[PDB]
């Protein structure tokens, strides 16, 4: 799976940079994803493994990938035809938990990325909503 | 720049 390589490589490249990680670099990143789109499941486990395994420092690059990738598959394939929303949004509950475990000052930056996905409807309220809820009860 | 979840695909 080369296309499949090639994402892993640029989803990596991460790790070569000290976060916030720069617009062209998601770029990157998110062009590699959308040409291995016939590997939509494997791009969708690459990316949950990394939020999984990485760094408190970049959780949220993690999800900026997946807010990348949605975004752009959603605009380039349209919004129905979109396969990463749905894949993404079978583990997501476990993909949040580990997301909730970045440094202290980097969970509002997750709650406004779930307020971006419920207000643009990327994703279903339904999937959204305990995410939230995940939030605020760690605030408690 | 850096990334931006209000920015345009
Ligand atoms: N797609």
Redesign the interface.
Known sequence: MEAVKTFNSELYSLMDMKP????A??TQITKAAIKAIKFYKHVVQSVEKFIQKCKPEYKVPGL?VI??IV??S???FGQEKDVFAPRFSNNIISTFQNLYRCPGDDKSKIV??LN?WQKNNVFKSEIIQPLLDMAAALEH | ???????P?
């Open positions: 916030p990680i720069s617009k670099k998601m900026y807010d990348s975004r752009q959603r605009h380039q406004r990325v971006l | 720049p850096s990334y931006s979840p209000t920015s695909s």
